[PDB]
Design an enzyme around this catalytic site. Structure first.
Site, PDB file in Angstrom:
ATOM      1  N   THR A 186       0.975  -1.219   0.037  1.00 37.67           N
ATOM      2  CA  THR A 186      -0.120   0.067  -0.221  1.00 37.67           C
ATOM      3  C   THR A 186       0.911   1.374  -0.067  1.00 37.67           C
ATOM      4  OG1 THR A 186      -1.853  -1.025   1.106  1.00 37.67           O
ATOM      5  CG2 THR A 186      -1.683   1.487   1.414  1.00 37.67           C
ATOM      6  N   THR A 187       0.411   2.330  -0.788  1.00 37.33           N
ATOM      7  CA  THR A 187       0.998   3.782  -0.563  1.00 37.33           C
ATOM      8  C   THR A 187      -0.281   4.618  -0.649  1.00 37.33           C
ATOM      9  OG1 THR A 187       2.644   2.785  -1.883  1.00 37.33           O
ATOM     10  CG2 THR A 187       2.610   5.310  -1.562  1.00 37.33           C
ATOM     11  N   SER A 200       3.353   0.487   2.947  1.00 40.16           N
ATOM     12  CA  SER A 200       4.714  -0.297   2.582  1.00 40.16           C
ATOM     13  C   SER A 200       5.384   0.517   1.355  1.00 40.16           C
ATOM     14  CB  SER A 200       4.500  -1.602   1.903  1.00 40.16           C
ATOM     15  OG  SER A 200       3.278  -1.539   1.121  1.00 40.16           O
ATOM     16  N   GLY A 201       4.971   1.428   0.681  1.00 45.73           N
ATOM     17  CA  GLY A 201       5.615   2.231  -0.153  1.00 45.73           C
ATOM     18  C   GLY A 201       5.595   3.685   0.133  1.00 45.73           C
ATOM     19  N   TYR A 252       4.608  -4.409  -2.849  1.00 49.27           N
ATOM     20  CA  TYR A 252       2.878  -4.467  -2.387  1.00 49.27           C
ATOM     21  C   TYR A 252       2.194  -3.178  -2.665  1.00 49.27           C
ATOM     22  CZ  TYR A 252       5.096  -8.426   0.211  1.00 49.27           C
ATOM     23  OH  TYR A 252       5.559  -9.525   0.542  1.00 49.27           O
TER      24      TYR A 252
END
Ligand SMILES: [Mg+2]
Ligand SMILES: [Mg+2]
Lengths: 222, 195, 212, 235, 204, 233, 240, 231, 244
Positions: free
Chosen positions: C1-2, C131-132, C170
């Site tokens: 996810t970002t 995660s990003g 991800y």
């Protein structure tokens, strides 16, 4: 130690058409390396032109389907026999699932039907109630074997128009109910070959404005 | 959060508190004020587990503000610190304790004296000339032991505080993104905007 | 996810990716990580679950009840705190949540609140969660100014998600853009990362490492 | 003394019958349902000229598609409104849709008989609940403290109710416009009110499918009052 | 981790001829870190003295609690509580937290106002009374204090001799304990006068 | 959460043209100790249902009492208790299934695998399974524990699918069951020779057979087997 | 617990316990509220039957709910303390959750809600108290004045009085208060408030209390001498 | 007189006046008729309006696919009792996979109404119910009184002027019981029965309310132009 | 049911009075007179025991004057048993406050707490109110010397000099006549005893019919001392002031 969860295997598949929807699922029920039943219905007609399947741990699946069917009944009592729209059913199911957020229904739920504009609809739920309307969704044991195939053959992913060489995508033309059923059957035939928990029989429920129709097909029993 | 310092000088209490807020791998904020004004002449800085810190600080603030309205009277720093200690002492044997350490810097208008109290999450209260929580004391106390005098001016207290912060910036592995400094005296609470 | 959100002259830009994974398995490429709390408030979804969906649609119910009782738009400060106070009650139980509650009111102006399942509630100008997030932060920090245009700000948010979508395994699928003004949020479309990447690579001259 | 939930020899609950007398003492509220919308109007009845009349809130929003007018002991209505607002919002959270006006009214009326020795007495207030949904269109309900609710094409409650209802009997037809209904409420309010009707001692409101529930401005109502006077002088 | 040895500290009490003595160090710490050199561990409620070692938050809490209880005792009884009675009160109060105890090592000291008899007592964290004639020890250097007291002590010491004994017992015990020291206080208690002396000791 | 103490092994069952057959041995094991040799694990409810139970015996005895109580309760204010409003297999099963799943959901399960066999009012065969997890399933052949692994394969050679049920007579079905019980005696280390068999037929009703024994066993070939490889004598 | 329904309807549709609570308010000392253009003033009567009182420590009739809102009352004094306490707690609770102090309307609505709840709860009697709640909303310069009563109804007022002989002072205010042009200054507003109390009070000595509330949490109570100057000036103009 | 202050008090002649006053509320209520054959069971209800602008108060409530009732008296109490029935019908279906017997449904209503007559503080229910249903023993019709007395009948009527319809059914007993496999004719007999209880007013399109349940007929209510056929 | 026998203690009269509070006040009017007088350098508490006996053990007896803490004392008028219930509650509140804030409870906060308890019994619970009126004599570092009174209604007020119990009308007139602001403790002692001597229903005021107390800063340096007078000490002050 007592483990309240189990895995009854199985695989389900929901596809939303232009003016119809299908929810398919194999009829095999298993534990470990044993077959419990070669025909144990998994996809259910819940009334109000909605079809549902809660795949995974069969006890939680049966409990959820039972509670949702019950929710449809009480919706009619409380709101003057109003028809439960597919989007409203979806939100209601979220709350049923999240109600057990800290001791979840160990199932991947899918419902299918028609939206209020008459178009095909499929909703997909994780075990704790996160949900989304989708055009295409396989669930259960062989979900990883089916979804990539559906991305390619339903949404025409990675496919381009010959001669252009990667410049023009293949146009997203609508699929007929006969065309969808072919992809459903080939998905389950392929899944049966490569996944041990998939087989015995395939039961498809087709939802249209006219109502709910059923179709059964044999699968390999090994 | 990370570093919170306190120093009681002649006529005031000075509280320094880091600005960094780190959540895992990233520094989400570099301007966070880890303090609440409990009453006009009482300030409380805090550090501990995420969520618990602010939840506790604001809860104390509301209770002191309620007392201030009910009685039309400001509680003494000592009285406030005793109230805060009890809440933490009650907290430690709860189902889920507050994981919060605090410094309470106040100026007692009755006694005309600055007062600095150090209270950890267990409810361990101590009145000090200078105090810290966590690893802050390990670096700073040796400097404070050496230089501190009870008759220091506020300007001298700030210079000694700069020397403490410099040592922290030199020897600590974590980048705490500097400190917000606040002074508590007879005139109330004010922030040193350049530090 | 970002997920990211940043304040600027023209209000707030909110940008998110669309990927959802269960381990290495990509469960969905078409996930909505921006909740439409109401026509004036937005929330982001990072954290892993239903928790953000469920509790932010609930938040919308609380905001509606507030303005029915008080005959006045709820503040972003109040709205965010209703959520943070709620998740703090559930602290320890295992809720997983990392969201930016974004809004634009008269008394506050454009406001962003980072809310966390640990109970953290932070006001700020730029936030990145997922995660990003580190990849998105790089592009944001080096290109951010208060005096960005609505056009450039929208692009910056889009490009920052793209940067993460590329590197973070991800994150990806597609980019959803929103622009929050005082009169409400405005949706700025779904942007497939696959198509966006080649478009950006050519037009911007970036990603020279990658062969296209 | 005697039980709160006691039956009289005629087969009626004493407390419910007495609460109906308190509603008769309340200020007049009128509702008129049409195919273009439902109109709600109330008499404010300020007890003194120093009372800022705009603070008199006897017309209230429950949801965007449901409004509500009250008459009687108006303090009692606050908890009923709260429950109604919660019920409307809660149903939207569970079902991602607007709630039926009848379903809302039924939820409110369930509170009514929850009294005994739960609350200590029935509500001393009647409600005119007006709204719109996709199933049954524009609707007007009358929610009593007995727990019973009737649907109405038009209804008046309060001190001038039986006089106003007789007037609504003659005037209402199925082809009324919204503008015709607005004036009709103003006409009947002016008839039964003690003081002379103006934009400060009377309030109008309506619910339409497009714009939802709206309380009328004193400037907007003033024009409708002036429009009324002229059309009554016209014959 | 071990609650009774986070903050550290010690208390020792002794009996003499028509007198009792109670003494404590002044250290409060967070394990290795020294935090305060003014944390006194001896309190008094009228003429009854109570020393408390162990977890500092509980030391403070129990002092506040026994102040609370002895104040109500005095209002109802119309007299100050005695050492024998207070000892029972301490034991009662500790045992009511049998399955969630205060991590402390209390020590009672005082002279019965009516009989004039010197009295000392000690407890474990859970309330068990240790009523010794000679001496009571408590804290992180209790082994050291046992060793010091056992050899240094002799019965019927005069107040000014007892001071030297209890002081040397405390000091030399604290100097062999990392978590004790940083100053020391000694109370010499007689039937109607009490002398409090701060001792000079090494500050490491 | 508990652990089973005194246990009962396989329960096997199958449908045939006019009804159902169910069987279960009369052993109550105590770990490897074959403690109790006279334990009835088929418990008939009325004249149209037989509940076969494997697993923990104390929990079986509890379930046994629940069913006994169910019959009593059904007779209360019920003039048609022995006629139209008598207990059906489908009623009895659904009740147990509810209890089993409720108990697992309170993390305090009835440590059992249950098979409800019976014949409905309209003559339909009823055969359904439920266990400690509340998992339910129906099939032409059902078996618990070792029966699932050894009995089902044999019983499925007789009735492999739904269309084979009308072709299967009671004599063929009973033969298959009795053979399966022998196979389990050969191969299940927690089984016994003595067993009970119940037939619920839509015409002849409930036939309950006690004190049956596994017979026609093959053991003679054992005399020839010597050593574990190279040994000749 | 005690569950007895004390507040109940009578045949004529009246709740006598709520009406008898209003009679307790009628007995209470007079309280008056007047809002000017940029201020609100709360006047209160102190009955001079009680001398040898210690006015330093004796509970003042006007109470601060927050730094920007005040509450005066007429009726049972003991009852008023319960409403004041609840209001003060709710004021801090609102600041804690909404991160903004209560509006005068909200605080009024809360107190009125409490009063209402006691008129249909089992085992409790209504509050024998009517309140005047005044102040300024946060970051707002518009004066606010509200009134509550035992039944639970509340409403806004340009000027209002409650308590004994409130009929008389309301008569005075109704002719002397102009809506188009309210008391422009603090002086004018206080003067009109004192004038209205002088219709009822008896002696203008220690019998009148005045509290002036201005925007941005600027609340101050006038002393005896300050009020006495208004009393002097009013009567000197009257001698004509 | 002195013994009607609450439900917990017997009179000197052994009467419960509060229950009898609750019984009186039924007589004030609008008329409703119940009747059955061997295949079907029918409810016919005369709905009452407040005035010409008002709607007509609904009289019939569905409890399950195979059961439902008509009310006469306090409607909110009928809502409470009908809701209770819905739950019991539902409990039977969920737990036992079994449709609740109509006779057993009556037993439950009796016991629920009884507890309100023996305890202090509460009050009896102010409504009478006519429960029809089709279960495993064919068609059924029950009459519930809030005293607790539930009675299985071939036909009956409750409400104002209900005696006229009740006498008609008593004469027609041998005819309407034989109306098997004919829903329309059974309803006709019900509409003709309820007509004996009418004075001044007659059966209009929004006045009449009819419900039916039978062998291959789920409990379905007919209102509006659906009952114009039978006027 | 039970309703039949309920007195309904917590209701208004048509006039807007609380029946039970009014009747409890009538009860208190028959109790022994208690007087409090506040001076610049201390407070006096004087109180009359009700028609005593010669066999009553006076030195161990306490019916009028009680100690709440080291700084605050009360004089009781009404049911002694009811007062003792409240007194123990007050003593606990003072200790709770001390434990929490590590400072002695301010007089008004303690008075408000007790008065709020009394109030609760008039508004809810269906129980009879406490038939007790208190005179609170106390000191704190904010307001210094303070006198208060509370009654069964839960209403409390501050005073320079005040009486409760019997003949308060006559007593309050005599105090209003001879009280002055610059008065001292020794003068207040004399006034208190002179007032009781005139208002008493007894033939003569003697030491055995009195309880007496003083709160003085007449303690060695900046601190406050409570003095509950002994029978012999009351006898002495009666001779000193010239009453016997
Ligand atoms: Mg990626
Ligand atoms: Mg050292």
């Amino acid at each position: 130690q007592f483990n309240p969860y189990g895995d009854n295997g199985g695989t389900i598949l929901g596809i939303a058409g232009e003016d119809f929807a299908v929810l398919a699922g194999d009829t095999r029920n298993i534990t470990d390396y044993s077959i419990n039943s070669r025909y144990e219905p998994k996809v259910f007609d819940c009334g109000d032109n909605i079809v549902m399947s809660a795949n995974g741990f069969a006890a939680d699946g049966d409990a959820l389907v039972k509670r949702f069917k019950n929710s449809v009944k009480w919706y009619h009592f409380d709101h003057n026999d109003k028809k439960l729209s597919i989007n409203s059913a979806a939100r209601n199911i979220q709350h049923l699932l999240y109600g057990k957020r800290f001791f979840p229904y160990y199932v991947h739920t899918i419902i299918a039907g028609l939206d209020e504009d008459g178009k095909g609809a499929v909703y997909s739920f994780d075990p704790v109630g996160s949900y989304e309307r989708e055009q295409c969704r396989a669930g259960g044991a062989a979900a990883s074997l089916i979804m990539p195939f559906l991305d390619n053959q339903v949404n025409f992913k990675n496919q381009y128009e010959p001669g252009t060489n990667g410049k023009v995508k293949k146009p997203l033309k609508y699929l007929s109910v006969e065309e969808v059923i072919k992809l459903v059957r080939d998905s389950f035939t392929s899944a049966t070959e490569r996944h041990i928990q998939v087989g015995d029989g395939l039961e498809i429920l087709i939802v249209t404005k006219d109502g709910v129709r059923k179709e059964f097909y044999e699968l390999k029993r090994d | 959060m990370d570093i919170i310092l306190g120093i009681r000088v002649q006529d005031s209490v000075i509280l320094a508190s880091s600005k960094a807020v780190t959540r895992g791998i990233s520094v989400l904020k570099d301007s966070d004020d880890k303090t609440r004004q409990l009453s006009p002449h009482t300030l409380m800085s805090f550090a501990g587990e995420a969520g618990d810190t602010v939840q506790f600080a604001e809860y104390i603030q509301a209770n002191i503000q309620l007392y201030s309205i009910r009685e039309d009277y400001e509680l003494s720093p000592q009285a406030v610190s005793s109230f805060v200690r009890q809440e933490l002492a009650k907290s430690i044997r709860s189902r889920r304790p507050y994981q919060v350490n605090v410094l309470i810097g106040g100026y007692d208008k009755k006694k005309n004296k600055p007062e600095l109290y150090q209270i950890d999450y267990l409810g361990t209260k101590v009145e000090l000339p200078y105090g810290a929580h966590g690893y802050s004391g390990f670096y700073t106390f040796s400097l404070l032991d050496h230089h501190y005098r009870p008759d220091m001016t506020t300007e001298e207290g700030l210079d000694l505080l700069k020397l403490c912060v410099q040592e922290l910036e030199k020897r600590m592995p974590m980048d705490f993104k500097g400190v917000i400094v606040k002074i508590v005296d007879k005139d109330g609470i004010r922030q040193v905007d350049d530090f | 996810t970002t997920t990211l959100a940043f304040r600027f002259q023209g209000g707030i830009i909110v940008a998110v990716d669309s990927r959802a994974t269960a381990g290495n398995w990509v469960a969905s490429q078409t996930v909505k990580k921006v909740i439409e709390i109401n026509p004036f408030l937005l929330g982001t979804m990072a954290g892993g679950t239903v928790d953000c969906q469920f509790w932010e649609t609930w938040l919308g119910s609380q905001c509606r009840l507030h303005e029915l009782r008080e005959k006045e738009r709820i503040s972003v400060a109040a709205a965010s705190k209703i959520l943070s106070n709620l998740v703090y009650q559930y602290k320890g139980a295992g809720l997983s949540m990392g969201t930016m509650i974004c809004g634009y009111t008269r008394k506050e102006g454009p406001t962003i609140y980072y809310v966390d399942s640990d109970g953290t509630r932070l006001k700020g100008d730029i936030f990145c969660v997922g995660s990003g997030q580190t990849f998105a932060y790089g592009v944001l920090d080096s290109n951010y100014k208060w005096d960005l245009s609505v056009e450039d700000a929208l692009y910056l948010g889009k490009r920052s998600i793209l940067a993460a979508a590329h590197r973070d395994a991800y994150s990806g699928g597609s980019v959803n853009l929103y622009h929050v003004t005082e009169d409400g949020w405005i949706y700025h479309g779904n942007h497939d990362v696959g198509e966006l990447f080649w478009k950006v690579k050519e037009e911007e001259g970036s990603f020279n490492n990658v062969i296209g | 003394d005697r039980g709160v939930s006691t039956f009289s020899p005629e087969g009626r609950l004493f407390q419910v019958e007495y609460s109906l007398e308190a509603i008769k003492l309340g200020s007049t509220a009128i509702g008129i349902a049409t195919k273009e919308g439902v109109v709600l109007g109330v008499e404010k009845r300020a007890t003194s000229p120093l009372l800022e009349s705009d603070s008199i809130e006897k017309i209230v929003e429950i949801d965007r598609h449901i409004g509500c007018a009250m008459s009687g002991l108006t303090a009692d209505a606050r908890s009923m409104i709260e429950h109604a607002r919660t019920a409307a919002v809660t149903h939207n959270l569970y079902y991602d849709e607007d709630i039926n006006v009848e379903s809302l009214t039924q939820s409110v009326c369930d509170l009514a008989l929850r009294f005994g020795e739960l609350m200590s007495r029935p509500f001393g207030v009647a409600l005119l609940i007006a709204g719109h949904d996709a199933d049954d269109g524009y609707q007007l309900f009358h929610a009593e403290p007995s727990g019973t609710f009737y649907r109405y094409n038009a209804k008046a409650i309060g001190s001038g109710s039986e006089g106003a209802q007789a007037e609504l009997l003659n005037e209402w037809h199925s082809s009324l416009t919204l503008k015709e209904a607005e004036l009709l409420v103003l006409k009947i309010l002016k008839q039964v009110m003690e003081e002379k009707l103006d934009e400060n001692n009377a309030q109008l409101s309506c619910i339409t499918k497009q714009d939802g529930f709206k309380i009328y401005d004193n400037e907007k109502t003033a024009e409708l009052i002036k429009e009324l006077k002229e059309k009554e002088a016209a014959e | 981790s071990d609650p009774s040895s986070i903050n550290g500290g010690i208390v020792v009490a002794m009996t003499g001829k028509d007198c009792v003595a109670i003494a404590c160090d002044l250290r409060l710490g967070s394990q290795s870190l020294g935090v305060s050199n003014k944390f006194e561990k001896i309190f008094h409620y009228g003429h009854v003295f109570l020393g408390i070692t162990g977890l500092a938050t509980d030391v403070t809490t129990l002092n506040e609690m026994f102040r609370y209880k002895t104040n109500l005792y005095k209002l109802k009884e119309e007299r100050a509580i005695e050492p024998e009675t207070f000892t029972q009160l301490v034991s009662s109060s500790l045992y009511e937290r049998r399955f969630g105890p205060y991590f402390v090592g209390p020590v009672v000291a005082g002279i019965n106002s009516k009989s004039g008899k010197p009295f000392i007592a000690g407890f474990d964290l859970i309330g068990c009374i240790d009523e010794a004639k000679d001496f009571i020890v408590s804290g992180t250097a209790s082994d050291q204090l046992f060793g010091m007291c056992e050899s240094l002590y002799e019965p019927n010491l005069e107040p000014e001799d007892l001071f030297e004994t209890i002081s040397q017992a405390l000091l030399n015990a604290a100097d062999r304990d990392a978590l004790s020291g940083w100053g020391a206080v000694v109370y010499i208690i007689k039937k109607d006068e009490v002398v409090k002396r701060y001792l000079k000791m090494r500050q490491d | 959460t508990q652990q089973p103490i005194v246990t009962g092994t396989s329960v096997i069952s199958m449908k045939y043209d006019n009804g159902v057959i169910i069987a279960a041995d009369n052993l109550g094991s105590y770990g490897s100790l074959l403690r109790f040799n006279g334990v009835e694990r088929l418990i008939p409810v009325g004249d149209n249902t037989v509940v076969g139970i494997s697993g923990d015996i104390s929990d079986m005895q509890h379930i046994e009492r629940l069913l006994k109580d169910l019959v009593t309760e059904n007779a209360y204010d019920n003039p048609l208790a022995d006629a139209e409003e008598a207990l059906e297999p489908s009623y009895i099963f659904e009740y147990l299934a509810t209890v089993m799943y409720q108990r697992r959901s309170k993390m305090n399960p009835l440590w059992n695998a249950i098979i409800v066999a019976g014949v409905q009012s309209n003559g339909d065969q009823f055969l359904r399974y439920v266990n400690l997890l509340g998992v339910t399933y129906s099939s032409p052949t059902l078996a618990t524990g070792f029966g699932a692994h050894m009995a089902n394969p044999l019983l499925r050679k007789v009735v492999d699918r739904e269309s084979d049920i009308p072709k299967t007579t009671v004599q063929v079905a009973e033969e298959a069951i009795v053979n399966a019980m022998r196979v389990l005696y050969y191969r299940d280390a927690r089984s016994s020779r003595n067993f009970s068999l119940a037939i619920i037929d839509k015409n002849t009703g409930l036939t309950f057979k006690k004190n049956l024994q596994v017979e026609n066993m093959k053991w003679d070939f054992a005399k020839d087997i010597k050593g574990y490889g190279t040994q000749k004598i | 617990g005690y569950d007895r329904a004390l507040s109940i309807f009578s045949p004529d549709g009246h709740i006598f316990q709520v009406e008898y609570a209003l009679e307790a308010v009628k007995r209470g000392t007079c309280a008056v509220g007047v809002k000017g253009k940029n201020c609100v003033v709360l006047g209160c009567e102190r009955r001079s039957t009680l001398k040898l009182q210690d006015t330093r420590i004796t509970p003042s009739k006007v109470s601060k709910i927050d730094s920007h809102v005040v509450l005066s009352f007429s009726g049972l004094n003991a009852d008023s303390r319960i409403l004041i306490e609840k209001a003060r707690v709710e004021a801090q609770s609102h600041r804690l959750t909404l991160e903004d102090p209560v509006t005068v309307e909200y605080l009024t609505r809360y107190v009125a809600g409490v009063q209402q709840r006691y008129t249909q709860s089992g085992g409790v009697r209504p509050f024998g108290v009517s309140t005047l709640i005044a102040g300024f909303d946060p970051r707002d310069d518009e004066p606010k004045l509200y009134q509550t009563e035992p039944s639970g109804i509340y409403s806004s007022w340009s000027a209002q009085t409650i308590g004994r002989n409130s009929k008389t002072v309301r008569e005075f205010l109704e002719k002397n208060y102009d809506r188009k042009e309210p008391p422009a200054t603090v002086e004018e507003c206080v003067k009109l408030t004192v004038r209205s109390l002088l219709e009822v009070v008896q002696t203008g000595a220690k019998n009148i209390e005045i509290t002036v509330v201005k925007p941005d949490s600027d609340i101050v109570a006038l002393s005896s001498e300050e009020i006495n100057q208004y009393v002097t000036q009013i009567e000197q103009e009257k001698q004509e | 007189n002195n013994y009607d202050g609450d439900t917990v008090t017997f009179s000197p002649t052994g009467r419960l006046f509060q229950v009898e006053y609750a019984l009186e509320a039924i007589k004030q209520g609008s008329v409703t008729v119940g009747l059955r054959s061997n295949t079907h069971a029918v409810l016919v209800a005369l709905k009452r309006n407040a005035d010409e602008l008002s709607s007509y108060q609904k009289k019939i409530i569905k409890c399950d696919e195979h059961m439902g009732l008509s009310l006469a008296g306090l409607a909110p109490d009928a809502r409470v009792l009908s809701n209770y029935l819905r739950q019991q019908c539902n409990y039977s279906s969920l737990v036992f996979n079994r449709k609740l017997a109509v006779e057993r449904a009556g037993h439950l209503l009796c016991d629920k109404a009884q507890k309100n007559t023996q305890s202090y503080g509460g009050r009896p229910y102010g409504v009478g119910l006519l429960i029809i249903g089709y279960d495993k023993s064919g068609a059924h019709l029950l009459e519930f009184q809030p005293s607790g007395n539930v009675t299985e009948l071939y036909g009956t009527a409750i409400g104002a002027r209900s005696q006229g319809a009740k006498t008609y059914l008593e004469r027609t007993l041998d005819t309407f019981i034989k109306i098997d496999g004919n829903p329309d004719e059974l309803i006709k007999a019900g509409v003709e029965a309820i007509s004996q209880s009418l004075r001044d007013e007659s059966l209009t399109v929004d006045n009449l309310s009819i419900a039916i349940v039978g062998k291959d007929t789920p409990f379905t209510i007919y209102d509006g132009e659906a009952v114009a056929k039978y006027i | 049911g039970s309703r039949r026998y309920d007195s309904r203690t917590t209701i208004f009269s048509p006039e807007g009075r609380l029946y039970q509070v009014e009747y409890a006040l009538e009860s208190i009017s028959h109790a022994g007179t208690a007087i409090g007088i506040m001076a610049s350098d201390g407070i006096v508490l004087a109180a009359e025991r009700k028609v005593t006996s010669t066999l009553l053990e006076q030195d161990t007896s306490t019916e009028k004057l009680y100690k709440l803490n080291d700084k605050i004392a009360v004089a009781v008028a009404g049911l002694t048993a009811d007062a003792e219930i409240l007194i123990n509650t007050a003593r606990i509140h003072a200790q709770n406050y001390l434990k929490t804030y590590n400072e002695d409870i301010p007089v008004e906060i303690l008075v408000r707490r007790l008065s709020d308890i009394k109030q609760g019994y008039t508004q809810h619970g269906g129980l009879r109110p406490f038939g007790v009126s208190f005179i609170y004599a106390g000191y704190d570092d904010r307001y210094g010397y303070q006198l208060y009174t509370s009654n069964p209604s839960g209403n409390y007020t501050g005073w320079k000099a005040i009486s409760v119990g019997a003949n308060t009308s006559a007593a309050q007139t005599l105090l209003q006549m001879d009280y002055k602001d610059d008065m001292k403790v020794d003068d207040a002692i004399e006034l208190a005893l002179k007032t009781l001597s005139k208002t008493t229903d007894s033939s003569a005021l003697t030491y055995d019919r009195l309880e007496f107390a003083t709160i003085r800063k007449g303690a060695n340096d900046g601190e406050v001392y409570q003095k509950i007078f002994k029978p012999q000490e009351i006898k002495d002050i009666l001779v000193k002031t010239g009453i016997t």
